Amino acid sequence: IKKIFTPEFRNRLDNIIWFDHLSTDVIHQVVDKFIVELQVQLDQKGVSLEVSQEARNWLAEKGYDRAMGARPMARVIQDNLKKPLANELLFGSLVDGGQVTVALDKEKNELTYGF
Amino acid sequence: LLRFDMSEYMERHTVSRLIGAPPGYVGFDQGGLLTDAVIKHPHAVLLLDEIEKAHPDVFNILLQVMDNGTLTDNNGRKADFRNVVLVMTTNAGVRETERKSIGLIHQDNSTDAMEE
């Protein structure tokens, strides 16, 4: 920053706020807000989603990357949950709304629910 | 008081903007940020901050002004430095004494800032 912004600019700021990298505890909190956003979208279709705690801990681990902040968490959730939901919403069992839950396997698989 | 920060005149392009060189000047008759400042206020004091950061072309334009009292604008107009005082600063002469030496016994790294 010091090499880009000359003193005339820097000396007139109230401050420079440095933001840090996200920790793994933060990731667990991040997963929860993303799961909530997913549920809001599902409410619009009449679908109730219940993700287990184990499934959350699993996703939190899969998406952690200290160097990329929270953006990978969004990708992980989209890839693991939005994907199979999309198939059911369009062609199958969730066309008319329904119940979805997710359990974690001993094999580290997402045991998605019937509907 | 007229002021310029030399760290902003560190690169060759910015140097021509300051000078008011026929090419590479500010606006159409800036010119010459330096020439203008010394035309508008001929008896002023000119302060150049942190001068070791200036591009060598700045360093040389200042030497030329020190020798003849004038700076020529891109439009042929001239600044008159015969009534001004040039104050140049720099925080380099004391940076060496901030160093900690090697060895089982640390020594006194005080230096002669004038030599620096």
Binding site: - | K100, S101, I102, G103, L104
Partner: protein
Amino acid sequence: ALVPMVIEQTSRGERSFDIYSRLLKERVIFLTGQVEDHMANLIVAQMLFLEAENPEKDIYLYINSPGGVITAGMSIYDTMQFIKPDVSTICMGQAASMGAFLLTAGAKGKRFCLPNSRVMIHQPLGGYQGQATDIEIHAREILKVKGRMNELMALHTGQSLEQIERDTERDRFLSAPEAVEYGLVDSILTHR
């Protein structure tokens, strides 16, 4: 190419560096072969050099050595105990005699050795020729050194002094797991 060159990029780099200098930059020092005076003199210079560059970071010392001169080895020992940053010692190959002595002198909790390494310890050797009077003088000095080395072993390993005294009577060989149990090292590195 007894020693190959490596290339790195930095600012405008470029810059090529003998592979051992390349590693000195990472705060890695190697100690190999016999411990003597010229070698030891150089290692001490490297440690002072790293201490000055950044007093807050660890220095890694790789040890692979059959033993050597005690005086030279003590020069290294005292510097390691003086300089501010921790020195973490890693044993590969072997650490015998004076080499073992320096291995245990590293920062507590940071003494580590590879799984197929060997550590061996034993009382100091010496000798002399001359008048019976001079033989007495020299015999007393070697005994004092033996005593001092045992105290330092007990201090760094946690063993009682008498246990140290018995165990160095004759060459004692320890496998990596034995070095851990005995207290010469804290742990064994396995795989990254």
